[PDB]
Design a protein around this motif. Sequence first.
Motif, PDB file in Angstrom:
ATOM      1  N   UNK A   1       0.827  -1.204   0.000  1.00 55.45           N
ATOM      2  CA  UNK A   1       0.000   0.000   0.000  1.00 55.45           C
ATOM      3  C   UNK A   1       0.862   1.256   0.000  1.00 55.45           C
ATOM      4  N   UNK A   2       1.858   1.311   0.888  1.00 52.25           N
ATOM      5  CA  UNK A   2       2.748   2.467   0.918  1.00 52.25           C
ATOM      6  C   UNK A   2       3.605   2.537  -0.339  1.00 52.25           C
ATOM      7  N   UNK A   3       3.901   1.390  -0.947  1.00 56.77           N
ATOM      8  CA  UNK A   3       4.636   1.335  -2.203  1.00 56.77           C
ATOM      9  C   UNK A   3       3.727   1.438  -3.418  1.00 56.77           C
ATOM     10  N   UNK A   4       2.411   1.514  -3.213  1.00 50.29           N
ATOM     11  CA  UNK A   4       1.429   1.607  -4.294  1.00 50.29           C
ATOM     12  C   UNK A   4       1.696   0.554  -5.371  1.00 50.29           C
ATOM     13  N   UNK A   5       1.896  -0.688  -4.920  1.00 53.80           N
ATOM     14  CA  UNK A   5       2.148  -1.817  -5.805  1.00 53.80           C
ATOM     15  C   UNK A   5       1.163  -2.963  -5.616  1.00 53.80           C
ATOM     16  N   UNK A   6       0.184  -2.826  -4.727  1.00 49.46           N
ATOM     17  CA  UNK A   6      -0.750  -3.913  -4.469  1.00 49.46           C
ATOM     18  C   UNK A   6      -1.572  -4.230  -5.713  1.00 49.46           C
ATOM     19  N   UNK A   7      -2.056  -5.470  -5.782  1.00 46.61           N
ATOM     20  CA  UNK A   7      -2.857  -5.944  -6.902  1.00 46.61           C
ATOM     21  C   UNK A   7      -3.976  -6.823  -6.358  1.00 46.61           C
ATOM     22  N   UNK A   8      -4.913  -7.184  -7.232  1.00 44.56           N
ATOM     23  CA  UNK A   8      -6.081  -7.965  -6.821  1.00 44.56           C
ATOM     24  C   UNK A   8      -6.358  -9.046  -7.850  1.00 44.56           C
ATOM     25  N   UNK A   9      -6.818 -10.222  -7.386  1.00 45.29           N
ATOM     26  CA  UNK A   9      -7.418 -11.193  -8.314  1.00 45.29           C
ATOM     27  C   UNK A   9      -8.855 -10.825  -8.651  1.00 45.29           C
ATOM     28  N   UNK A  10      -9.030 -10.005  -9.689  1.00 44.97           N
ATOM     29  CA  UNK A  10     -10.346  -9.448  -9.988  1.00 44.97           C
ATOM     30  C   UNK A  10     -11.357 -10.538 -10.322  1.00 44.97           C
ATOM     31  N   UNK A  11     -10.917 -11.606 -10.993  1.00 49.34           N
ATOM     32  CA  UNK A  11     -11.842 -12.676 -11.359  1.00 49.34           C
ATOM     33  C   UNK A  11     -12.603 -13.186 -10.143  1.00 49.34           C
ATOM     34  N   UNK A  12     -11.915 -13.340  -9.010  1.00 49.36           N
ATOM     35  CA  UNK A  12     -12.588 -13.775  -7.792  1.00 49.36           C
ATOM     36  C   UNK A  12     -13.662 -12.779  -7.373  1.00 49.36           C
ATOM     37  N   UNK A  13     -13.368 -11.482  -7.487  1.00 52.63           N
ATOM     38  CA  UNK A  13     -14.332 -10.456  -7.095  1.00 52.63           C
ATOM     39  C   UNK A  13     -15.648 -10.643  -7.837  1.00 52.63           C
ATOM     40  N   UNK A  14     -15.580 -10.897  -9.146  1.00 51.92           N
ATOM     41  CA  UNK A  14     -16.800 -11.027  -9.936  1.00 51.92           C
ATOM     42  C   UNK A  14     -17.661 -12.179  -9.428  1.00 51.92           C
ATOM     43  N   UNK A  15     -17.049 -13.342  -9.199  1.00 49.09           N
ATOM     44  CA  UNK A  15     -17.810 -14.496  -8.730  1.00 49.09           C
ATOM     45  C   UNK A  15     -18.433 -14.218  -7.368  1.00 49.09           C
ATOM     46  N   UNK A  16     -17.642 -13.678  -6.439  1.00 43.85           N
ATOM     47  CA  UNK A  16     -18.152 -13.403  -5.101  1.00 43.85           C
ATOM     48  C   UNK A  16     -19.225 -12.323  -5.122  1.00 43.85           C
ATOM     49  N   UNK A  17     -19.085 -11.330  -6.003  1.00 40.50           N
ATOM     50  CA  UNK A  17     -20.087 -10.273  -6.091  1.00 40.50           C
ATOM     51  C   UNK A  17     -21.434 -10.831  -6.530  1.00 40.50           C
ATOM     52  N   UNK A  18     -21.431 -11.733  -7.508  1.00 35.27           N
ATOM     53  CA  UNK A  18     -22.661 -12.359  -7.979  1.00 35.27           C
ATOM     54  C   UNK A  18     -23.376 -13.076  -6.839  1.00 35.27           C
ATOM     55  N   UNK A  19     -25.434  -9.975  -6.638  1.00 29.21           N
ATOM     56  CA  UNK A  19     -25.740 -10.195  -8.040  1.00 29.21           C
ATOM     57  C   UNK A  19     -27.221 -10.113  -8.362  1.00 29.21           C
ATOM     58  N   UNK A  20     -28.055 -10.808  -7.578  1.00 29.89           N
ATOM     59  CA  UNK A  20     -29.507 -10.717  -7.783  1.00 29.89           C
ATOM     60  C   UNK A  20     -30.007  -9.284  -7.873  1.00 29.89           C
ATOM     61  N   UNK A  21     -29.705  -8.482  -6.849  1.00 26.70           N
ATOM     62  CA  UNK A  21     -30.201  -7.111  -6.812  1.00 26.70           C
ATOM     63  C   UNK A  21     -29.660  -6.295  -7.980  1.00 26.70           C
ATOM     64  N   UNK A  22     -28.365  -6.427  -8.273  1.00 21.95           N
ATOM     65  CA  UNK A  22     -27.784  -5.678  -9.384  1.00 21.95           C
ATOM     66  C   UNK A  22     -28.306  -6.192 -10.720  1.00 21.95           C
ATOM     67  N   UNK A  23     -28.520  -7.505 -10.831  1.00 19.23           N
ATOM     68  CA  UNK A  23     -29.059  -8.065 -12.065  1.00 19.23           C
ATOM     69  C   UNK A  23     -30.435  -7.488 -12.370  1.00 19.23           C
TER      70      UNK A  23
END
Lengths: 80, 297, 141
Positions: free
Chosen positions: B56-78
């Motif tokens: 975070x202090x080095x501003x180098x963090x990353x994320x596995x975005x694919x996981x976010x999509x699956x976990x986010x899924x969804x009824x209300x937004x759909x």
Amino acid sequence: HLASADWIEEPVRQKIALTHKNKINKAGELVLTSESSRYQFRNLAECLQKIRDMIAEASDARLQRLRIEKMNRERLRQKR
Amino acid sequence: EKYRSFERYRRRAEQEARAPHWWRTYREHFVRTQKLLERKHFLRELRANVEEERAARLRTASIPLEAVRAEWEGPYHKQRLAEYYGLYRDLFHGATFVPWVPLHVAYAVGEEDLIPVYHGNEVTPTEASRAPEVTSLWTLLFINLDGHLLEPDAEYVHWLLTNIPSNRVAEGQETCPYLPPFPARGSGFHRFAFLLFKQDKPINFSEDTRPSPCYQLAQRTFRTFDFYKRHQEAMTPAGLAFFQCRWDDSVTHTFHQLLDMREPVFEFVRPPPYHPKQKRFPHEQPLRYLDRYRDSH
Amino acid sequence: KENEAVAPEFTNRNPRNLELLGVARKERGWATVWPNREFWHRLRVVKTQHHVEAFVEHLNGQVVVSASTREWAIKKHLYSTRNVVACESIGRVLAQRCLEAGINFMVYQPTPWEASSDSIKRLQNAMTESGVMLREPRRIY
């Protein structure tokens, strides 16, 4: 018929078509009308004069955006 | 208190405008618990991680975005997408249902890949040459909400399956054979929505059975609301998937080859020309006054 | 042929048909109010005390695509809700939600300090690489 007409030189025909595309029918003919006088000959005379003016006077980001939206759709089309 | 930044006034002003008021304004005229505890434990672990702090202090963090999509899924937004595009108003006469089954559809193109069908997606009719892949004992219907050419409320079917055993769709009765999209030219984007309805009990939908093959628009036309109303007792929708299609060369093939009709072409209809009504006898009318009124001047 | 029967005028009911075609009306009033209202959709970025949120909102004020670090899926993989990297992730996540929603065009009007913020700049970099356009097409009259 603007394109088929041979009396107009070809370079003028293309310029007229681009400039006054809105006045070209789907058949490709150039249509102009006059109903501003009580005299039939005046309407004909006005129509003829406009044609003469067109001959003498005649003698991109949009494309990029279309690529961008198409490119966006392909990237948007990712659920495999 | 005085706003120390423009945004503070703007955010409050924007919120203030949104809220209705007694005085006339523009807007009025023109307008479970156990899981969270587990989530909290992860937060403590994530926050504690020294490596994550360093990133975070080095501003180098990353994320596995694919996981976010699956976990986010969804009824209300759909639901939002279907309601936003007007499926509910056209399909159920305004009835709104939260989709609970994460229905996902894609139009199979060749064999290498299958074109996704998102909510609000755009898919060309050419790509939809063949029927798409859709993923208990339920039903499934296909619709052309605005693809109808004659009647606004009416809509056409692509293919309708009934009594779909569990999920396997191959066993469903092919009441309506598949038809490729046929959106009329000059009408922009036509929205086609895929609906999944819970089937309480297996019921023979003889009324909805159609001849195979059928190439008649007079028999493809139907209404979802009355069809659903007839079966609304045992039908509760749960899945949604809809895409947009423009005109394309395949559309000409569809209209002529099998639909056997001239391609429909539409455009905004302009009003009839306005003509001034001159007086037959211009009594006490000079030329200077008439000169301004007439074209010559 | 029964199929040939077609009405003289089409009946398109898609709300975004005009917007997608570009013929939909954009607010051209509010000449005495800033900023311009000539945008169908706008990106609203709200940085709270402990969370950073980004939304895409229509003129009516109803968000169609909402991306927030408050959402469970993003936060579990995201170290700190308030961070420069978080702005990038929410932009990429907001794009993916925009990809999910089918919205390809948007109008972004950052504030003087917000624009200068590198995190918001990286968030804009996240949107452009994902394909989401910060500028909408012009209306057609």
